[PDB]
Design an enzyme around this catalytic site. Structure first.
Site, mmCIF file in Angstrom:
data_model
loop_
_atom_site.group_PDB
_atom_site.id
_atom_site.type_symbol
_atom_site.label_atom_id
_atom_site.label_comp_id
_atom_site.label_asym_id
_atom_site.label_seq_id
_atom_site.Cartn_x
_atom_site.Cartn_y
_atom_site.Cartn_z
ATOM 1 N N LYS A 170 28.472 0.039 8.841
ATOM 2 C CA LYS A 170 28.089 -0.737 7.662
ATOM 3 C C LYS A 170 29.167 -0.739 6.577
ATOM 4 C CE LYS A 170 24.287 1.563 6.882
ATOM 5 N NZ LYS A 170 24.646 2.529 7.962
ATOM 6 N N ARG A 222 16.639 2.303 2.256
ATOM 7 C CA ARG A 222 16.700 3.288 3.333
ATOM 8 C C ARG A 222 15.296 3.630 3.814
ATOM 9 N NH1 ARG A 222 22.068 5.605 3.401
ATOM 10 N NH2 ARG A 222 22.135 6.997 5.227
ATOM 11 N N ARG A 242 35.364 10.597 11.957
ATOM 12 C CA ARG A 242 35.241 9.950 10.651
ATOM 13 C C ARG A 242 35.962 10.734 9.557
ATOM 14 N NH1 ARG A 242 29.922 7.116 7.931
ATOM 15 N NH2 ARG A 242 29.021 9.222 7.858
ATOM 16 N N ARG A 287 33.419 14.788 6.067
ATOM 17 C CA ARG A 287 32.170 14.921 5.338
ATOM 18 C C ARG A 287 31.345 16.067 5.911
ATOM 19 N NH1 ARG A 287 29.629 8.943 4.330
ATOM 20 N NH2 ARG A 287 27.762 10.244 4.742
ATOM 21 N N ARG A 346 20.218 13.407 10.821
ATOM 22 C CA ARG A 346 20.255 12.086 10.171
ATOM 23 C C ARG A 346 19.749 10.951 11.059
ATOM 24 N NH1 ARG A 346 26.284 11.613 8.375
ATOM 25 N NH2 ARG A 346 25.649 9.709 7.254
HETATM 26 N N1 LIG Z 1 32.920 -1.254 15.420
HETATM 27 C C1 LIG Z 1 33.337 0.036 15.358
HETATM 28 N N2 LIG Z 1 33.774 0.682 16.460
HETATM 29 C C2 LIG Z 1 34.211 1.950 16.442
HETATM 30 N N3 LIG Z 1 34.228 2.697 15.324
HETATM 31 C C3 LIG Z 1 33.801 2.176 14.139
HETATM 32 C C4 LIG Z 1 33.319 0.789 14.084
HETATM 33 N N4 LIG Z 1 32.968 0.546 12.799
HETATM 34 C C5 LIG Z 1 33.199 1.681 12.096
HETATM 35 N N5 LIG Z 1 33.703 2.648 12.898
HETATM 36 C C6 LIG Z 1 34.069 4.038 12.514
HETATM 37 O O1 LIG Z 1 32.890 4.818 12.731
HETATM 38 C C7 LIG Z 1 32.597 5.645 11.610
HETATM 39 C C8 LIG Z 1 31.323 5.123 10.933
HETATM 40 O O2 LIG Z 1 31.564 3.869 10.287
HETATM 41 P P1 LIG Z 1 31.006 3.584 8.797
HETATM 42 O O3 LIG Z 1 31.341 2.149 8.425
HETATM 43 O O4 LIG Z 1 31.477 4.728 7.922
HETATM 44 O O5 LIG Z 1 29.406 3.755 9.073
HETATM 45 P P2 LIG Z 1 28.152 3.607 8.052
HETATM 46 O O6 LIG Z 1 28.663 3.055 6.727
HETATM 47 O O7 LIG Z 1 27.225 2.676 8.811
HETATM 48 O O8 LIG Z 1 27.627 5.015 7.922
HETATM 49 C C9 LIG Z 1 33.827 5.577 10.716
HETATM 50 O O9 LIG Z 1 34.715 6.648 11.102
HETATM 51 C C10 LIG Z 1 34.433 4.221 11.042
HETATM 52 O O10 LIG Z 1 35.842 4.182 10.812
HETATM 53 N N1 LIG Z 2 18.970 4.717 -0.230
HETATM 54 C C1 LIG Z 2 18.931 6.060 -0.016
HETATM 55 N N2 LIG Z 2 17.765 6.750 -0.012
HETATM 56 C C2 LIG Z 2 17.709 8.088 0.165
HETATM 57 N N3 LIG Z 2 18.804 8.847 0.358
HETATM 58 C C3 LIG Z 2 20.032 8.267 0.396
HETATM 59 C C4 LIG Z 2 20.171 6.819 0.200
HETATM 60 N N4 LIG Z 2 21.492 6.520 0.264
HETATM 61 C C5 LIG Z 2 22.135 7.691 0.497
HETATM 62 N N5 LIG Z 2 21.267 8.719 0.582
HETATM 63 C C6 LIG Z 2 21.626 10.129 0.819
HETATM 64 O O1 LIG Z 2 23.032 10.210 0.908
HETATM 65 C C7 LIG Z 2 23.415 10.572 2.268
HETATM 66 C C8 LIG Z 2 24.659 9.826 2.644
HETATM 67 O O2 LIG Z 2 24.416 8.429 2.724
HETATM 68 P P1 LIG Z 2 25.531 7.447 3.294
HETATM 69 O O3 LIG Z 2 26.779 7.553 2.442
HETATM 70 O O4 LIG Z 2 24.938 6.086 2.989
HETATM 71 O O5 LIG Z 2 25.659 7.662 4.786
HETATM 72 C C9 LIG Z 2 22.175 10.258 3.092
HETATM 73 O O6 LIG Z 2 22.138 10.950 4.335
HETATM 74 C C10 LIG Z 2 21.058 10.645 2.137
HETATM 75 O O7 LIG Z 2 20.945 12.066 2.045
#
Ligand SMILES: Nc1ncnc2c1ncn2[C@@H]1O[C@H](COP(=O)(O)OP(=O)(O)O)[C@@H](O)[C@H]1O
Ligand SMILES: Nc1ncnc2c1ncn2[C@@H]1O[C@H](COP(=O)(O)O)[C@@H](O)[C@H]1O
Length: 214
Positions: free
Chosen positions: A13, A88, A123, A156, A167
């Protein structure tokens, strides 16, 4: 232009948000990034959120809805915004619907758990901006550093193996029902719904988004 991104944590995302932000010139509103900002500032909100985030659990709907309300009232959100990691939960979606926030697109990135578990290991994140990288799938141009600011990237704490499983369980229980929720909204003609196979390569996912939007 108002857009919601849905999908498992690690689905891609935030990565696709970058592409979308630049295409539409709208700000990204990421609840995770807002929470990490509060942690950095060392607020009472930050201190409380840190342990929840580290456990892989969700922060309270009430705290979240108030952060988002304040954020979207800012001037940079007047011509649109991208919601990333929000809503969420069902109550967060209802909170948004109740205040009459209507969105143009809800975009779902569909990625299996096994793929997510694979992905989280490499990541790397730039905390201040929320930009993320992957040391295999999408590396920074300079190892260990953000492409935009030059600042250090981090692993992270919630990207740990066991926390990721936590998660994904939270996601399947509390957040996956948003797929139905917004599928219904789209059926009512309140939004356009798009679903993509998020296991494709980054550039491939972006190419499909490009074709599907506008
Ligand atoms: N289409 C894809 N294929 C492989 N790896 C990806 C893809 N999109 C994102 N990633 C990688 O996977 C991890 C999760 O992506 P991220 O955009 O941070 O996920 P989200 O925001 O949904 O938590 C990151 O390390 C990112 O660079
Ligand atoms: N909309 C939301 N509602 C509740 N918790 C959240 C939300 N967005 C982020 N968090 C918290 O922040 C963490 C990291 O979120 P993210 O950066 O979006 O992957 C999550 O696992 C939750 O603990």
């Amino acid at each position: 232009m108002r857009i919601i991104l849905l999908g498992a944590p690690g689905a891609g995302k935030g990565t696709q948000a970058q592409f979308i932000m630049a295409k539409f010139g709208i700000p990204q509103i990421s609840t995770g990034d807002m929470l990490r900002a509060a942690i950095k500032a060392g607020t009472e909100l930050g201190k409380q959120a840190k342990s929840v985030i580290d456990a892989g659990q969700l922060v309270s709907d009430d705290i979240i809805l108030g952060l988002v309300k304040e954020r979207i009232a800012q001037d940079d959100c007047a011509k649109g915004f991208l919601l990333d990691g929000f809503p969420r939960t069902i109550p967060q979606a209802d909170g948004l619907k109740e205040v009459g926030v209507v969105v143009d697109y809800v975009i779902e990135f569909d990625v299996a758990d096994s793929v997510i578990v694979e992905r989280m290991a490499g990541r790397r994140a730039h905390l201040a901006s929320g930009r993320t990288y992957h040391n295999v799938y999408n590396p920074p141009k300079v190892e260990g550093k953000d492409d935009v600011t030059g600042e250090d990237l981090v692993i992270r704490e919630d990207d740990k193996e066991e926390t990721v499983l936590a998660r994904l369980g939270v996601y399947h229980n509390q957040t996956a029902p948003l797929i139905a929720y917004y599928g219904k909204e789209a059926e009512a003609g309140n939004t356009q719904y798009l679903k993509f196979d998020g296991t494709k390569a980054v550039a491939e996912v972006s190419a499909e988004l490009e074709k599907a939007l506008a």
